[PDB]
Scaffold this active site. Structure first.
Site, PDB file in Angstrom:
ATOM      1  N   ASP A 122       0.801  -1.200   0.000  1.00 20.03           N
ATOM      2  CA  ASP A 122       0.000   0.000   0.000  1.00 20.03           C
ATOM      3  C   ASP A 122       0.841   1.261   0.000  1.00 20.03           C
ATOM      4  OD1 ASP A 122      -1.924   1.903   0.477  1.00 20.03           O
ATOM      5  OD2 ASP A 122      -2.220   1.326   2.585  1.00 20.03           O
ATOM      6  N   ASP A 143      -2.043   5.615  -5.001  1.00 17.47           N
ATOM      7  CA  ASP A 143      -2.340   4.754  -3.854  1.00 17.47           C
ATOM      8  C   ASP A 143      -2.776   3.347  -4.256  1.00 17.47           C
ATOM      9  OD1 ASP A 143      -3.298   3.767  -1.421  1.00 17.47           O
ATOM     10  OD2 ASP A 143      -4.883   5.244  -1.246  1.00 17.47           O
TER      11      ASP A 143
END
Ligand SMILES: COC(=O)[C@H](Cc1ccccc1)OP(=O)([O-])[C@H](Cc1ccc2ccccc2c1)NC(=O)[C@@H](NC=O)C(C)C
Ligand SMILES: COC(=O)[C@H](Cc1ccccc1)OP(=O)([O-])[C@H](Cc1ccc2ccccc2c1)NC(=O)[C@@H](NC=O)C(C)C
Ligand SMILES: *[C@H]1O[C@H](CO)[C@@H](O)[C@H](O)[C@@H]1O
Ligand SMILES: *[C@H]1O[C@H](CO)[C@@H](O)[C@H](O)[C@@H]1O
Ligand SMILES: *[C@H]1O[C@H](CO)[C@@H](O)[C@H](O)[C@@H]1O
Ligand SMILES: *[C@H]1O[C@H](CO)[C@@H](O)[C@H](O)[C@@H]1O
EC number: 3.4.23.20
Lengths: 323, 323
Positions: free
Chosen positions: A33, A213
């Protein structure tokens, strides 16, 4: 010098992408992430019922405890996790970080208890936002950065196919043409960048900023942009059961693109069809609202169209269409 | 230019120090804490049972909600709190911060549910460690800093007497002699400083670093230093019921001092007697272990002996004996 390649694999509907990571000899499947800075894993400290259907880290076997240290994180969707901290060996794609801080979960919210596809998250945002108290720790990337051939990582997330995370080198066979770079604002700890303008189908509009992201499934944009986009989709309607705008699966979706330092990043309409809404016979749109937070989230729907280089020198992001 | 004086008052045994703060017209009694960067308050979003015996902030009346924003914090003793975020007017000692982020509590751990002496905490550590997601906010001090006569605050915490927080100016009548300054390392967001050496009664030893922290009641030091200190106290023994070393209340305690950039900061033995241990007839020592965290916490026991200036220029800390 070091470099490595970790293969990622999408779960059903590309909802998330997992990659194996070996910690203290045990391999866990983690969700990488770029939107957060914590490396946290399911551990033996969780209630036994919560360990079921996961590979868990046992800190007692190989970790060195940081006495008095704790961590607690809260994500965009409201999920959360907290626990204690150990240092251990962490290997990703053949690249080993020795003494990497591993955040062992002691409590996790319902979202994580329900998701058996991953055993935790490996954060790749800037270390400045790592949540460890009383002194924050470095991400796997910042830990190994100085040992790599080049202080960068790159990612190619694919639709229903394995993809890669390249550490310390750029694989030119993964994209068409040359890379275009743009400056990153890391002040809030994200890989933030500006776009000069966008085009939603037949409508164009002014620029805005957003974050790259990998941890977010969708492309989250301002409400005004979402409205503009869906006003062009025949029959589009919001369905709270599904989580946002949905439409007939056979609908022809317009493309969406953004201009970034002269480069046009285009997400073809076919990728904007996320998949069945779960809500009977409609499909969920890959574009949805950012809830008014003031910046856009360039999640997996967008990343599936590009090869993206996260370069610590600058810092800066490089983009080119995936090959 | 602005400046102001907020009066603090210690609770029983100087366990904590409260100061009134007016938010959106409602006055709450907050614990000012130089060891953290969040301003959080009991609010109407808590269960009604948890609001009892507190002055609570009602965000709906005057606050502007930051939609999608959240906060979650974990302290040294393991306590925690979390909630949502609003901006509002916050006045402290006649100095008003407009648009200050106020963190409204939605959940609080047992420690806070038990403590009816305060209605929340006002953080004064560096803004870099503020917990608000997705974008961190500034502390009251950083918000008003540019409007103050000088970008600093100073504190005089007293034993069983009202004390003050001076904002934007130094009150020379609060200390004897001149101030000695030392450089601050703000890399982990704390008001961290180095001491060159220490003297525990009849024993002296090498230096170490520590943080100036109004939010911690005691002086927490490495286990080796604690042992050295208590080896000199006749009959001292640990009592887990009390929370650490305890001794006969009439015992003569040695002084403790640290050398900081040439200045000797001395905590007289009388201040090291914290108060009744609650454990029958012994007293609790003001010096206790830091649990092996690697740096010392210069809490209230230490601060009660000095006037301390927190200067953003440098940054640096100034010290002189209280008058
Ligand atoms: C503190 O910043 C974050 O949480 C960052 C950045 C951010 C900020 C604000 C809004 C959205 C995203 O999200 P992330 O680390 O990628 C974060 C990572 C994350 C969170 C919960 C999870 C629960 C189960 C499995 C994976 C998870 C991954 N993803 C999300 O929170 C989103 N969830 C999905 O798209 C919501 C936006 C839809
Ligand atoms: C994340 O850093 C903190 O929590 C900072 C710095 C720190 C770090 C590590 C160890 C001790 C202190 O503590 P603080 O903000 O001053 C933090 C503030 C704090 C925490 C809980 C509270 C519960 C009830 C009332 C006031 C409270 C104040 N105090 C304490 O946690 C300590 N409590 C007491 O000495 C434990 C050390 C004894
Ligand atoms: C990544 O790059 C390193 C450094 O050149 C190589 O040693 C490795 O085999 C991989 O190609
Ligand atoms: C993961 O697997 C992919 C192909 O499935 C390889 O390209 C990569 O080197 C890694 O072994
Ligand atoms: C603090 O300092 C300001 C600026 O000099 C004064 O205006 C105020 O009255 C107080 O003395
Ligand atoms: C708080 O109260 C003290 C004395 O109790 C004053 O010195 C200060 O100015 C503030 O009003």
């Amino acid at each position: 010098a070091a470099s490595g390649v970790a293969t990622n694999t999408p779960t059903a509907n590309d909802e998330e992408y997992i990659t194996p990571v070996t910690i203290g000899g045990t391999t866990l499947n983690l969700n990488f992430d770029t939107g957060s800075a914590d490396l946290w894993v399911f551990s033996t400290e969780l209630p036994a019922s919560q360990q079921s259907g996961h590979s868990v880290y046992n800190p007692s076997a190989t970790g060195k405890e940081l006495s008095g240290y704790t961590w607690s994180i809260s994500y965009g969707d409201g999920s959360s996790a907290s626990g204690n901290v150990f240092t251990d060996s962490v290997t990703v794609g053949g690249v080993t970080a020795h003494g990497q801080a591993v955040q062992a979960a002691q409590q996790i919210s319902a979202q994580f208890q329900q998701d058996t596809n991953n055993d935790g998250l490996l954060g790749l945002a800037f270390s400045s936002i790592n949540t460890v108290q009383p002194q924050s720790q470095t991400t796997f990337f910042d830990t190994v950065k100085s040992s790599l051939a080049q202080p960068l990582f790159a990612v190619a997330l694919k639709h229903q196919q394995p993809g890669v995370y390249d550490f310390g080198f750029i694989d030119s066979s993964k994209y068409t043409g040359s890379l275009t770079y743009t400056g990153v604002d890391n002040s809030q700890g994200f890989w933030s960048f500006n776009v000069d303008s966008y085009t939603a189908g037949s409508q164009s509009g002014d620029g805005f900023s957003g974050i790259a992201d990998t941890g977010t499934t969708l492309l989250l944009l301002d409400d005004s942009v979402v409205s503009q986009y869906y006003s062009q989709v025949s029959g589009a309607q919001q369905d709270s059961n599904a989580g946002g705008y949905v439409f007939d699966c056979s609908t022809n979706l317009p493309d969406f693109s953004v201009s970034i330092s002269g480069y046009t990043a285009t997400v073809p309409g076919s990728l904007i069809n996320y998949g069945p809404s779960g809500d009977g016979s409609t499909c969920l749109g890959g574009i949805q609202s950012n809830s008014g937070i003031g910046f856009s989230i360039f999640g997996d729907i967008f990343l599936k169209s590009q090869y993206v280089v996260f370069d610590s020198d600058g810092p800066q992001l490089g983009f080119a269409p995936q090959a």
